[PDB]
Symmetry: D2
């Protein structure tokens, strides 16, 4: 069987618009952590990697980065952070928040380790999809509930490496 293309992708947010938003988020984060000397940025794999890579290069001061892998089902830790959390300023960095369910469970687990502070930063937010009230400190774009990919977001492990955010559109 030959499988014909069944969808295409159309740019929704360009690489340049994302770059602009990162400048804004970095101004907000840098201002927020002005009186902090060290910041630990924790990304959730796989989706946060592109965003974390770009953002971390704009954050000032002593910055450390780390990653965790969790399952979306209870939230299971597939890979924990390698850094100590207690007494540290911690910023969780995520590509997209929709339901909030995963981020809320990750927040709760980290809070147990008594960071000095815990904040959450998401590039994209679908506020319509929210199912639990998780506090998000820094938000890039507010978007409708579209089928989106790119800049770390996959569909069937495809499109994670698009430099822009696209919606997946049927023929």
């Amino acid at each position: 069987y030959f499988q014909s293309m069944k969808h295409t992708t159309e740019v929704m947010i360009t690489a340049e618009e994302i770059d602009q938003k990162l400048d804004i988020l970095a101004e907000q984060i840098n201002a927020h952590y002005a009186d902090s000397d060290r910041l630990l940025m924790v990304g959730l794999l796989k989706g946060s990697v592109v965003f974390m890579a770009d953002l971390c290069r704009r954050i000032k001061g002593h910055v450390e980065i780390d990653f965790m892998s969790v399952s979306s089902r209870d939230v299971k830790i597939l890979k924990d952070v390698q850094s100590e959390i207690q007494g540290r300023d911690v910023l969780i960095v995520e590509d997209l928040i929709d339901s909030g369910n995963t981020l809320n469970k990750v927040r709760d687990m980290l809070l147990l380790r008594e960071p000095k502070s815990l904040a959450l930063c998401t590039l994209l937010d679908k506020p319509e999809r929210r199912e639990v009230d998780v506090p998000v400190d820094f938000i890039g774009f507010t978007i409708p509930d579209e089928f989106i990919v790119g800049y770390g977001i996959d569909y069937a492990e495809q499109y994670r490496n698009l430099p822009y955010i696209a919606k997946v559109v049927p023929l």
Copy 2:
């Protein structure tokens, strides 16, 4: 420099496992299913012997973990939400690690969470962790065997020994 001397014999442990199993079986008599979770590596021998005496629909699972920080090196594979969960441990002394594990598991909203330890050193307690089932209450002796190591050795002793 050191040697080992038997403190609690294999036969004494065997008798206490029957006593623990009766308490556990009575406690979960009305439960749909029980998930028993051991912490690696120390819990494996105790868990292996104990789970064989527990009635009903039993599943077993393991975690590996290594102050408020904890690192989860391996989480449980099984679902926790809405299930009866029994944490199975060889020895509780400070309770520091167990308390952190208990707190993390509580976030997953098990129907119930309980703790069983073969050995308890109550004089060593540094945090108030609730312990539901205890085999033997012991002084702070330097002990190995039945899963408990010194520098990774002696976990395979069938008895609990004092290191002399």
Copy 3:
């Protein structure tokens, strides 16, 4: 939708573990120290029982791998393997596909020696010819549970090996 029927009693398993320990202990007579490495979750009861019968300076460890779909390491061993005598301890071998990948992974770490012990072997299922040094029982291709082996996560805690009658 199903029942169980005893295939190997707890007594028969106990007797076979004595035979296996005799073989293992004789095999490692000259060994300074042995690392026994069990695969989770299936090997845990067999490991617990067997390790208590093995002589000398013994250390135990565990790994968790996904079933062969690649064989992925979900939890690696904590111990160093390089230059150690290592015995992999498994509940059951059938296709051999998973154990073959595990053996290969451990060989890459350059142990002093590597050997494999399985309590149960279904040789009519073998797809890859992984060398096994110690075998407890050779069994027909039956739907089996108990002594660490599950059906849908149930029955791992049965103290005997049982056939499921569907």
Copy 4:
């Protein structure tokens, strides 16, 4: 110590275009490319490079620690029958990459290749095949663009020499 730019962000950017053209030509005929990075050092290079690679691309990550190379987190994605590209920020001794390449070869990828942004050929202690190299550099003490000194400097947008 202090730091001094050795390779600018613009220079890295120019080289990533060169690397991307080589990779894109090499994999023009590929059904699925899987790019695999080692945490944490490869994340920045991976993020930049993957955005320039054409076709069906998936990315994944492993965490390994050297003593044996133990797998702290394996890839989530399937390797068997796929074209796989290991993406690394720096190769010096090659020891860890050689063990990683060997482990991935066991999974029978269609093809396996290695790309590094930086190579210190004079530091090589094992013969690992490297298919794509960005910059060949002397054994300078360096940080930035994912490479740390005691966990610091990973977020520098350029590659800096540490001058003590």
